[PDB]
Amino acid sequence: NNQQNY
Amino acid sequence: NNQQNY
Amino acid sequence: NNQQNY
Amino acid sequence: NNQQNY
Amino acid sequence: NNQQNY
Amino acid sequence: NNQQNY
Amino acid sequence: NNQQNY
Amino acid sequence: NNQQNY
Amino acid sequence: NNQQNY
Amino acid sequence: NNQQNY
Amino acid sequence: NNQQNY
Amino acid sequence: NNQQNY
Amino acid sequence: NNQQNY
Amino acid sequence: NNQQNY
Amino acid sequence: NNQQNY
Amino acid sequence: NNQQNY
Amino acid sequence: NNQQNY
Amino acid sequence: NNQQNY
Ligand SMILES: [Zn+2]
Ligand SMILES: [Zn+2]
Ligand SMILES: [Zn+2]
Ligand SMILES: [Zn+2]
Ligand SMILES: [Zn+2]
Ligand SMILES: [Zn+2]
Ligand SMILES: [Zn+2]
Ligand SMILES: [Zn+2]
Ligand SMILES: [Zn+2]
Ligand SMILES: [Zn+2]
Ligand SMILES: [Zn+2]
Ligand SMILES: [Zn+2]
Ligand SMILES: [Zn+2]
Ligand SMILES: [Zn+2]
Ligand SMILES: [Zn+2]
Ligand SMILES: [Zn+2]
Ligand SMILES: [Zn+2]
Ligand SMILES: [Zn+2]
């Protein structure tokens, strides 16, 4: 699973 | 699993 | 931010 | 930030 | 920041 | 598992 | 920062 | 497991 | 900073 | 396991 | 800083 | 295990 | 700094 | 195990 | 600084 | 085991 | 500084 | 085991 917070 | 906080 | 992998 | 891998 | 690997 | 906090 | 590997 | 705090 | 390897 | 605090 | 290897 | 505090 | 190797 | 405090 | 090798 | 305090 | 080798 | 205090 992937979570990216820019 | 991956979490990246920029 | 929160990521939980059960 | 929080990442928990159970 | 917190990372816990059970 | 990977957590990166920039 | 905290990393715990059980 | 990997945690990097920049 | 804290790293614990059980 | 790896923890780097820059 | 703290590193404990059990 | 590795912990580096720069 | 503290390193304990049990 | 390795701990380096710069 | 403290290093204990049990 | 290795601990270096610069 | 303290180093104890049991 | 190695402890170096610079
Ligand atoms: Zn942003
Ligand atoms: Zn940011
Ligand atoms: Zn699962
Ligand atoms: Zn699991
Ligand atoms: Zn596990
Ligand atoms: Zn930042
Ligand atoms: Zn384990
Ligand atoms: Zn920073
Ligand atoms: Zn273990
Ligand atoms: Zn820094
Ligand atoms: Zn052990
Ligand atoms: Zn520093
Ligand atoms: Zn032992
Ligand atoms: Zn320094
Ligand atoms: Zn021993
Ligand atoms: Zn110094
Ligand atoms: Zn002995
Ligand atoms: Zn000195």
Short mmCIF file of all heavy atoms in Angstrom, two decimals, chain I:
data_model
loop_
_atom_site.label_atom_id
_atom_site.label_comp_id
_atom_site.label_asym_id
_atom_site.label_seq_id
_atom_site.Cartn_x
_atom_site.Cartn_y
_atom_site.Cartn_z
N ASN I 1 16.36 10.95 19.76
CA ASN I 1 15.80 9.90 18.88
C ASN I 1 15.95 8.52 19.52
O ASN I 1 16.92 8.27 20.27
CB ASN I 1 16.46 9.90 17.51
CG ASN I 1 16.43 11.29 16.86
OD1 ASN I 1 15.34 11.82 16.59
ND2 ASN I 1 17.61 11.92 16.67
N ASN I 2 15.02 7.61 19.20
CA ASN I 2 14.94 6.26 19.80
C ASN I 2 14.80 5.17 18.73
O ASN I 2 13.91 5.28 17.86
CB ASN I 2 13.73 6.20 20.78
CG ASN I 2 13.64 4.87 21.54
OD1 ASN I 2 14.53 4.53 22.30
ND2 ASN I 2 12.57 4.12 21.30
N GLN I 3 15.65 4.12 18.80
CA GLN I 3 15.51 2.90 17.97
C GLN I 3 15.65 1.68 18.92
O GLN I 3 16.69 1.53 19.54
CB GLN I 3 16.52 2.78 16.81
CG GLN I 3 16.29 1.55 15.88
CD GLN I 3 17.48 1.25 14.94
OE1 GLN I 3 18.59 0.93 15.41
NE2 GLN I 3 17.26 1.33 13.62
N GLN I 4 14.60 0.84 19.01
CA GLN I 4 14.63 -0.38 19.83
C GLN I 4 14.35 -1.60 18.91
O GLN I 4 13.34 -1.61 18.19
CB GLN I 4 13.65 -0.28 21.05
CG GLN I 4 14.12 0.66 22.17
CD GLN I 4 13.02 0.97 23.18
OE1 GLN I 4 12.06 1.68 22.87
NE2 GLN I 4 13.15 0.40 24.40
N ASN I 5 15.28 -2.60 18.96
CA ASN I 5 15.29 -3.82 18.10
C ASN I 5 15.18 -5.04 19.05
O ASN I 5 16.15 -5.43 19.68
CB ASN I 5 16.56 -3.86 17.23
CG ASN I 5 16.79 -2.53 16.46
OD1 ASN I 5 16.07 -2.22 15.49
ND2 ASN I 5 17.78 -1.76 16.90
N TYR I 6 13.98 -5.61 19.14
CA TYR I 6 13.66 -6.61 20.16
C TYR I 6 14.08 -8.05 19.76
O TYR I 6 14.54 -8.25 18.59
CB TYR I 6 12.16 -6.51 20.58
CG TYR I 6 11.76 -5.18 21.24
CD1 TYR I 6 11.31 -4.11 20.45
CD2 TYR I 6 11.83 -4.96 22.64
CE1 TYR I 6 10.98 -2.88 21.01
CE2 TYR I 6 11.49 -3.73 23.22
CZ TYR I 6 11.06 -2.67 22.41
OH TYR I 6 10.72 -1.44 22.97
#
